[PDB]
Amino acid sequence: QISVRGLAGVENVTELKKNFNRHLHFTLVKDRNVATPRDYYFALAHTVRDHLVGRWIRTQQHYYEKDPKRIYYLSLEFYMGRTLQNTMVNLALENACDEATYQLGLDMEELEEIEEDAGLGNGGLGRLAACFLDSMATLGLAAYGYGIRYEFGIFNQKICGGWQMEEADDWLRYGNPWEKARPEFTLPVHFYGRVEHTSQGAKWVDTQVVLAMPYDTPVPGYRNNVVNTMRLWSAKAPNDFNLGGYIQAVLDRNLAENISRVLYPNDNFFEGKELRLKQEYFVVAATLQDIIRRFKSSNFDAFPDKVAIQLNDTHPSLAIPELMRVLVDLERLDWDKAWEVTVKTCAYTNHTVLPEALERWPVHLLETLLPRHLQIIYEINQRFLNRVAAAFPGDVDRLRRMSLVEEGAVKRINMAHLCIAGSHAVNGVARIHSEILKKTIFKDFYELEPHKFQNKTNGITPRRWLVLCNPGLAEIIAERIGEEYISDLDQLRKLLSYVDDEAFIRDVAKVKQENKLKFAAYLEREYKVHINPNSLFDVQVKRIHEYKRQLLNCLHVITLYNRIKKEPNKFVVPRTVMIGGKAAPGYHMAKMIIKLITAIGDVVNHDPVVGDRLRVIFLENYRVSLAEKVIPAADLSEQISTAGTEASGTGNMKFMLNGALTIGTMDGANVEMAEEAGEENFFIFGMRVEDVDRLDQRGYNAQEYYDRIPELRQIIEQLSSGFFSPKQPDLFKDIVNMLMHHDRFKVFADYEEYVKCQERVSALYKNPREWTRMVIRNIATSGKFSSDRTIAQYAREIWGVEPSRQRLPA
């Protein structure tokens, strides 16, 4: 149908049809008489998978022949979403499979909906790793993603009586056709035990063993025949494990295998839980043995020339002392040489500044679980602090600030300090964030080793986040400027010369309208929800956290409602306000915020005076597959975190690429987005980082704002008095209390500017032609935010490898 979806050749369509029937018969053991749509999905997935394997085998053979420097991206999260469509896109098979399935009497889009998300992440950090894998393959890098194969990913969210309920995400129930188990590369991982000192060095003995079994998933590059590997480890008990009586010993194997059972959902809130530490060591120990094995199958002086390890936050930070352990205790390198190799091999990416998100492990846990690692960490600390002392003599305060060991009630190890000490590069994820790291929380480290500190502004893959989710937009762009922009997104700048083209303006607006109709219908179908598709689609989707300020959005929604009720016969631009996202199960305030949003909906959506002028919908179970639907449909993207709190953001970039305008604070990557598009083409409001600092110096007093802004006072009185919870009038008292007395994120301080900025949005939306022209200026300048640009920068400035756009042969 559309050109960017590739060719449907007679030969290709014929071959796909016959391979589909082969799999249905031999693989699934069904015939057309009893087959369900799920059977048909699986037959298609196996058919597409067959096209990967030749390229997969020869890519890995190629790396063996050429022996390039290998990049190892270590992460506890890979938020991959669905794989079928992505694979078809990257292999140029979409139109062919569409034709083939159509000729079999099947609708491919219906089959696509059957696949489960691989929801092995919480949000931005996990999704970044997934975008990165796609870009690394597209740029021809010899890259491997390493993580954990969780049996249960991020929970499925149900809303019952306006409250979040969690259920287990049993994503593997029907099988996963994309992975290949590799039980033959199973490796042992050690826990507990004790350290013995011999004449011939230290020995870690009397350990418990858990096995790490790998599962490999292919990662196809865009139309270059490169297929890289994501290797995820699964925990297995050894067969003599624990070996009445006999029965209980077999049942107790679950203790070991629980390591890979479930993803922790409490993102941005560190807890010192033993099981989480076991997960972190498990991925690190198995991965490093795999790395060393592959390196030997070609003297460790050359190790950093052949290996780069990228740490996705501190979660895999134990790689540093584990590499030292292996080099010193097993390979018998002297300490100094091992440390040189380690530093040159490892690099660390920081993704947070909130103090409660930093990993600070109690020493007593490390002592029991990983006694040799604690010893190595103490030794690293002593040598590092000796360097600090020599560079800043007499500065005893600096010594305690920079220590890897935190003194206090409970002694803790600061894993961020360990990563900085043990890495040759440390980066933040947007310019403002990287500057904040050097000026505040890692100031001391920057003063000691300025050369370590870099910026790598985040990005998103334009394959999933434009071609896959918004083919209509991809097509009208390709009509004007060709197809090359899909792997060179800076070419979108060429669209500036169409900002006054009447045909293009109409097509851009038509594509948005079609997306909005499609989404409005999805809403009715799957959730009996009933929206006006002519309204402005005002969308805030991301995890629920106080710093992200879903509450500020709520205050605006109630302001609009109150204004309508005050002057009901006045014209207002109609809106559909959609808020979505998961709350961490133990985060009470986040759970109350979800309840508030649904409670506002209950009042607003049933008030006959409002009509269809305002609707408030909570988008249930926000995840990658839902993002692919709602983002192309959005008019307005809400990026309204308190300045200094969102390290980068990546949802922001997805909305920009798909034709929404942005209302946002000067936080994270919003700053660079506004800089690229022009501030006149962005709806910027609120305190800058400098203003937040000034307020903190004086002291934030929320009462001052309540006293001076009558519209705000009205809302607080409504919340307090039970207007939004008539049967339980005190329901939202915790929210009101926090807002008035303990608000770390200064919701009231940006309220007035936010409401005024929202008025300017509504004014522009009344003039469709000028709205759309501003959209074109956003899409056209979104090129910097391709993860291909990001990865090219990691490759040249951190890993020391050159990207390539050249095809491997088919």
Ligand X SMILES: O=C(CCCc1ccc2c(c1)CCCC2)N[C@@H]1O[C@H](CO)[C@@H](O)[C@H](O)[C@H]1O
Task: List binding-site positions for AMP.
Answer: 31, 64, 293-298
Tell me how far apart the alpha carbons of residues 556 and 534 are, in angstroms, rounded to a whole number. Answer: 20
774 in contact with ligand X (CB under 6 A): no
Per the CB < 8 A criterion, the answer to whether 187 and 209 are in contact is: no
Spell out, one character per residue from 486 to 505, where the chain touches ligand X: x when CB under 6 A holds, - when not. Answer: --------------------
> Which of ligand X, a second copy, none is residue 268 near (CB under 5 to 8 Å by kind)?
ligand X
CB of 255 to a second copy, least distance (A): 9
Tokens of 45: 């997935």
Per the CB < 8 A criterion, the answer to whether 24 and 38 are in contact is: no
650 in contact with ligand X (CB under 6 A): yes
Backbone φ, ψ for residue 148 (5° rounding): -120, 135
- Other Cβ atoms less than 10 A from the Cβ of 678: the count is 12
124 in contact with ligand X (CB under 6 A): yes
> Which of a second copy, ligand X, none is residue 482 near (CB under 5 to 8 Å by kind)?
none
CA angle 503, 506, 507 (to 5 degrees): 85
In the bound state with a second copy, the residue whose beta carbon lies nearer, of 241 and 685, is 241
> Which of ligand X, a second copy, none is residue 313 near (CB under 5 to 8 Å by kind)?
ligand X
The amino acid at 698: R
> Which of a second copy, ligand X, none is residue 300 near (CB under 5 to 8 Å by kind)?
none
In the bound state with ligand X, the residue whose beta carbon lies nearer, of 515 and 639, is 639
267 in contact with ligand X (CB under 6 A): yes
312 in contact with ligand X (CB under 6 A): no
266 in contact with ligand X (CB under 6 A): yes
217 in contact with ligand X (CB under 6 A): no
> Which of ligand X, a second copy, none is residue 165 near (CB under 5 to 8 Å by kind)?
a second copy
Tell me how far apart the alpha carbons of residues 87 and 90 are, in angstroms, rounded to a whole number. Answer: 5
CB of 154 to a second copy, least distance (A): 11
Tokens of 631: 């983002």
SS3 639: strand
Rg (CA), the chain: 27
In the bound state with ligand X, the residue whose beta carbon lies nearer, of 166 and 488, is 166
Q: Which of 179, 313, 546, 676 binds ligand X (CB under 6 A)?
A: 313
> Which of ligand X, a second copy, none is residue 357 near (CB under 5 to 8 Å by kind)?
ligand X
Give, for 580, the enclosing helix (H) or strand (E). strand 575-580
- Binding to ligand X in span 351-370, by CB under 6 A: 351-352, 357
> Which of a second copy, ligand X, none is residue 251 near (CB under 5 to 8 Å by kind)?
a second copy
342 in contact with ligand X (CB under 6 A): no
639 in contact with ligand X (CB under 6 A): no
- Using the contact rule CB under 6 A, the part of the chain among 163-171, 186-194, 613-621, 647-655 near ligand X is 647-655
Tell me how far apart the alpha carbons of residues 511 and 569 are, in angstroms, rounded to a whole number. Answer: 32
> Which of ligand X, a second copy, none is residue 57 near (CB under 5 to 8 Å by kind)?
a second copy
- How remote is the C-alpha of 809 from its chain's centroid? 32
CB of 170 to a second copy, least distance (A): 6
Exposed e or buried b for every residue in 478-517, given b needs 16+ CB within 10 A?
A: beeeeeebbbebebbbebeebeeeeebbebbbebbeebbe
Measure the CA dihedral 37/38/42/43, to 10°. -30
Q: Which of 90, 470, 625, 648 binds ligand X (CB under 6 A)?
A: 648
- Other Cβ atoms less than 10 A from the Cβ of 171: the count is 19
Measure the CA dihedral 10/13/18/22, to 10°. 160
Per the CB < 8 A criterion, the answer to whether 329 and 338 are in contact is: no
The amino acid at 70: R
Tokens of 385: 């602090």
CB of 99 to ligand X, least distance (A): 38
CB of 246 to ligand X, least distance (A): 12
Tell me how far apart the alpha carbons of residues 239 and 196 are, in angstroms, rounded to a whole number. Answer: 27
CB of 147 to ligand X, least distance (A): 13
Per the CB < 8 A criterion, the answer to whether 316 and 350 are in contact is: no
CB of 163 to ligand X, least distance (A): 22
CB of 198 to ligand X, least distance (A): 38
Tell me how far apart the alpha carbons of residues 12 and 2 are, in angstroms, rounded to a whole number. Answer: 17
Measure the CA dihedral 487/493/496/502, to 10°. 0
In terms of Cβ atoms closer than 10 Å to its own Cβ (0-12, 13-18, 19+), residue 261 is middle
- Using the contact rule CB under 6 A, the part of the chain among 84-92, 117-125, 466-474, 477-485 near ligand X is 117-125
Backbone φ, ψ for residue 161 (5° rounding): 60, 30
In terms of Cβ atoms closer than 10 Å to its own Cβ (0-12, 13-18, 19+), residue 149 is buried
19 in contact with ligand X (CB under 6 A): no
In the bound state with a second copy, the residue whose beta carbon lies nearer, of 258 and 455, is 258
Binding-site entries: 31, 64, 293-298
Neighbouring-strand partners of residue 187: 212
In the bound state with ligand X, the residue whose beta carbon lies nearer, of 262 and 709, is 262
In the bound state with ligand X, the residue whose beta carbon lies nearer, of 635 and 646, is 646
Per the CB < 8 A criterion, the answer to whether 69 and 800 are in contact is: yes
Tell me how far apart the alpha carbons of residues 455 and 793 are, in angstroms, rounded to a whole number. Answer: 9
458 in contact with ligand X (CB under 6 A): yes
Q: In what order do the strands lie in the sheet with 683-684?
A: 614-619, 575-580, 536-541, 636-639, 661-664, 683-684
> Which of ligand X, a second copy, none is residue 156 near (CB under 5 to 8 Å by kind)?
a second copy
> Which of ligand X, a second copy, none is residue 56 near (CB under 5 to 8 Å by kind)?
a second copy
428 in contact with ligand X (CB under 6 A): no
- Using the contact rule CB under 6 A, the part of the chain among 363-371, 631-639, 644-652, 740-748 near ligand X is 644-652
278 in contact with ligand X (CB under 6 A): no
The amino acid at 793: Q
429 in contact with ligand X (CB under 6 A): yes
Per the CB < 8 A criterion, the answer to whether 486 and 786 are in contact is: no
- Using the contact rule CB under 6 A, the part of the chain among 47-55, 200-208, 259-267, 514-522 near ligand X is 259-267
In the bound state with a second copy, the residue whose beta carbon lies nearer, of 102 and 174, is 174
Residue 608: closest CA among 642, 565, 570, 649: 565
Residues taking part in catalysis:
351, 542-543, 548, 650, 654
Tell me how far apart the alpha carbons of residues 376 and 328 are, in angstroms, rounded to a whole number. Answer: 10
Size of site (CB under 6 A) for ligand X = 23
CB of 88 to a second copy, least distance (A): 18
Q: Which of 87, 95, 122, 658 binds ligand X (CB under 6 A)?
A: 122
CB of 598 to a second copy, least distance (A): 20
> Which of a second copy, ligand X, none is residue 258 near (CB under 5 to 8 Å by kind)?
a second copy
What residues line the site for a second copy (CB under 8 A)?
A: 25-26, 29-31, 36, 38, 50, 53-54, 56-57, 61, 152, 155-156, 165-168, 170, 173-175, 180-181, 183-184, 236-237, 239-241, 243-247, 250-251, 253-254, 258, 261-262, 264-265, 273, 275, 585-586
State the angle between helix axes of 550-566 and 710-721 in degrees (0 to 180), rounded to the nearest 10.
100
Tokens of 351: 């993704």
Tell me how far apart the alpha carbons of residues 651 and 656 are, in angstroms, rounded to a whole number. Answer: 9
647 in contact with ligand X (CB under 6 A): yes
In the bound state with a second copy, the residue whose beta carbon lies nearer, of 24 and 429, is 24
In the bound state with ligand X, the residue whose beta carbon lies nearer, of 270 and 754, is 270
Tokens of 6: 């590739």
Residue 685: closest CA among 624, 753, 594, 775: 753
CB of 264 to ligand X, least distance (A): 4
Tell me how far apart the alpha carbons of residues 310 and 513 are, in angstroms, rounded to a whole number. Answer: 42
Tell me how far apart the alpha carbons of residues 628 and 81 are, in angstroms, rounded to a whole number. Answer: 10
Contact positions vs ligand X (CB under 6 A): 122-125, 128, 264, 266-270, 313, 351-352, 357, 429, 458, 646-650, 668
